[PDB]
Write a protein that binds this DNA or RNA. Structure first.
Ligand SMILES: [Ca+2]
Length: 341
DNA sequence: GGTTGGATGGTAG
DNA sequence: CTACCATCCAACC
């Protein structure tokens, strides 16, 4: 069981570097701009010179602007990076045909066939790294071990433009002195929830009862963490697929008014049908983030696929229903497409 | 255990 | 923020 996990360095902000190579060795800040008062939104990426002063993904742009007004701020042509991204997954493919893609900047090979050992994986890892740079000029950080986790952590280690191999030995020393924060899948909140309760490293979850675990952080992650602490996590490298496809866009203000919301709600359906391409969903869900931050889904499931027109007037009915149940003015809206054929 | 309800939170790029 | 998944009461074949 050998894994070859690849990961595209500060990807979005990195592609803007290669595109405009007069944008480099400098603070770059890829941004999703919301629309409201004189900028507003949140960071989706920043290169390392940016995020060495704190300007990291998901923080209000005004901070990014109040730590690095120096910086370069660029919008977020997610389409574009997608283009460039897909092209990489082809290269990752050539060298092993069990390519589990995850996020736009990430993917895993189960190369256990075109390697006899780990020495040879490093050599390959350099190959891939050398082919992705050559053809698209994008540095990426490979990571290698027994499993998609250890593979990922090893990348988390020498993260920017790097390559590491966690054999079995280092597999075991991590578990003891690897923090639950640094354990992929586990975002902070789970960690801080665990952090609070005396609970830091991953192995500590073996000195703790199970029902006092799914009674805080839940099963999937309860077991998931206990399995790697036991080490019995070496589960498969299988491709990923999309259930939902949505777009909740920010309105001009807060509106209890069928007509006010409509074009925003129709603009969503619109773009939602950009990203959907050839495919055809059975179910639809009209999302609403209110005045405050409540979230007010109502939805509908068919025994057929939906068609865009159908998708508009059904959306409204599903919106009408938000207004004789909610009474609070609504300040964000969108749609969602579950259940594909 | 399936399956369609909706409300929240957690994990990302 | 935008996007997507998981996650947990609630009905009910
Ligand atoms: Ca990544």
């Amino acid at each position: 069981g050998i894994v070859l996990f690849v990961d595209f360095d500060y990807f979005y902000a990195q592609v803007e570097e290669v595109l405009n190579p007069s944008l480099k060795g400098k603070p770059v800040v890829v941004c999703v701009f919301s629309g409201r008062f004189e900028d507003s939104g949140a960071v989706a990426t920043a290169n390392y010179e940016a995020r060495k002063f704190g300007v990291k993904a998901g923080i209000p742009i005004v901070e990014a602007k109040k730590i690095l007004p120096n910086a370069v701020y660029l919008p977020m042509r997610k389409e574009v990076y997608q283009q460039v991204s897909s092209r990489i997954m082809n290269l990752l493919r050539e060298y092993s045909e069990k390519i589990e893609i995850a996020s736009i900047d990430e993917a895993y090979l189960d190369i256990s066939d075109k390697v006899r050992d780990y020495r040879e994986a490093y050599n390959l890892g350099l190959e891939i790294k050398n082919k992705i740079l050559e053809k698209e000029k994008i540095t990426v950080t490979v990571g290698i071990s027994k499993n998609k986790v250890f593979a990922k952590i090893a990348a988390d280690m020498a993260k920017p433009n790097g390559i590491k191999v966690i054999d079995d030995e280092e597999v075991k020393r991590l578990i003891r002195e690897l923090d639950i924060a640094d354990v992929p899948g586990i975002g902070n909140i789970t960690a801080e929830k665990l952090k609070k309760l005396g609970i830091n490293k991953l192995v500590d979850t073996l000195s703790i009862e199970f029902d006092k675990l799914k009674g805080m952080i839940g099963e999937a992650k309860a077991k998931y963490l206990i399995s790697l602490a036991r080490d019995e996590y070496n589960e498969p490298i299988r491709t990923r697929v999309r259930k939902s496809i949505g777009r909740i866009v920010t309105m001009k203000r807060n509106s209890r008014n069928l007509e006010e919301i409509k074009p925003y709600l129709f603009r969503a359906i619109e773009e939602s049908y950009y990203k959907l391409d050839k495919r055809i969903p059975k179910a639809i869900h009209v999302v609403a983030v209110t005045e405050d931050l409540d979230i007010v889904s109502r939805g509908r499931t068919f025994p057929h696929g939906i068609s865009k027109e159908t998708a508009y007037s059904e959306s409204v009915k599903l919106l009408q229903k938000i207004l004789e149940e909610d009474e609070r003015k609504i300040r964000r809206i969108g749609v969602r497409f579950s259940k594909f054929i």
